[PDB]
Design a protein around this ligand. Sequence first.
Ligand SMILES: [Cl-]
Ligand SMILES: [Cl-]
Lengths: 267, 267
Amino acid sequence: PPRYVIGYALAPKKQQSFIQPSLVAQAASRGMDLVPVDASQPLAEQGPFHLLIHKLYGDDWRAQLVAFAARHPAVPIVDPPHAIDRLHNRISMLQVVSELDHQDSTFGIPSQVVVYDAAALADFGLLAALRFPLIAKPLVADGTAKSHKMSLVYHREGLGKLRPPLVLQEFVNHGGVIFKVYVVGGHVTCVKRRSLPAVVPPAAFINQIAGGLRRALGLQLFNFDMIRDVRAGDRYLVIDINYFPGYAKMPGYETVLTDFFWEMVHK
Amino acid sequence: PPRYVIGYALAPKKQQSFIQPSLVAQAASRGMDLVPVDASQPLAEQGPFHLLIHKLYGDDWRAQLVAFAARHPAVPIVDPPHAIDRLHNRISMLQVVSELDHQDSTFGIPSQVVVYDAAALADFGLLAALRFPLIAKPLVADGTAKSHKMSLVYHREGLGKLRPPLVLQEFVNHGGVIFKVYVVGGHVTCVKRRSLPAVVPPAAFINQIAGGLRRALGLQLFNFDMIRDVRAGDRYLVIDINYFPGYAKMPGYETVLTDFFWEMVHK
Ligand SMILES: [Cl-]
Ligand SMILES: [Cl-]
């Protein structure tokens, strides 16, 4: 019958990991043509698309997506740059998680300390009452930098050498395990990574959170970090959310994505 | 010669305090007609304006200002709603203050604790090492609510009864004085309010900060709260910023505003 064009605008490293022959071939076998977006030409002069997927940042790419969205309201963008932006301030991101509605399993948000300058990082009294280890992230980051990754701190001296502005979370109530939950539209997958280089949370609970994050963030492609609060044992916290992660690591990612692409071009 | 129309879109209480006969008459004496915007009609069908000043919130008023700004790019809006929004998240607001560049007087940003839910407000260990009193604000607020005001907390029991999500700042290093600095474009005024119901900071320093906030926030009308860190005695912190404050309280506000309106319609 008819064919659907899936335009992709990805950095070369993300093309190499995500746009694999096995994905291109599975999708073509179902009538879907994955077509790269030329970065050296405007998207406006670039050919019919039934779906645009991207992981590019900055005001020129944003402007192109803003114009594309005006010219072609019915063509889904995954994901809209105003929705990716909701992840860029750690404090406003966790604010979005705090808006979700709430069985046997409970859902929390971990308190944060924000330190804006070097003087505060030396002299703020409260920092001497922190339990270690800490999770530290820059307050604002898009993920593109290596220094935008959540990093562990083991003592006051290590904290003292970080670059403010930063957000600090205590990291002691979780029994040294982290659950990375991969989401693709209505579909969840879950990876029992072990932090500080086990029993998974209930699947129905994870699906409720995954779906609430999708509706609240307006993102189809993301992965959320979750911990068990092992004081109580049936309490869980979301500690991070990341746009369009390394799906290529999960075996069977090609089938999950192809199913998602097919769903999106029949919305 | 020609006359200039200054449209104003204000709540009735703000009309009563700010749009006083003495302001209307001074401005008319200089060729400037202050004209109220009809809230029951679209702004698009509302008459030539050489300047629009407002203090209204919400998506309908925003949409009207977005359309006005497209149709009439050369007519200044004071202030643009995307710029007022920069004040609505306390953490991203202080992030904007942290971006300013930096003599005898130094300039800091106070560390904050963010508490997202009721469980954290009871159980977060770090809160038992806070010094009191604290400044507490909701993480997100526009100022229109009575509960959106920065409030003082004197002990753990009082902290325990607040409504998260909230931002906590220790409030002990300032020797019980707060400086409210009123800004109108390039012009500063300064009020030695005494907190917890004196020597002012140097005027050149205040003007540098006022001007950096104006460029960074893109606001003409605001007031910033500043404290002296009395450990060192030549260090100052910005602890709050508010859109379009009670200028009518300062004597001589009519002359300051009329001069600002005249400057804006000759940009
Ligand atoms: Cl990938
Ligand atoms: Cl007023």
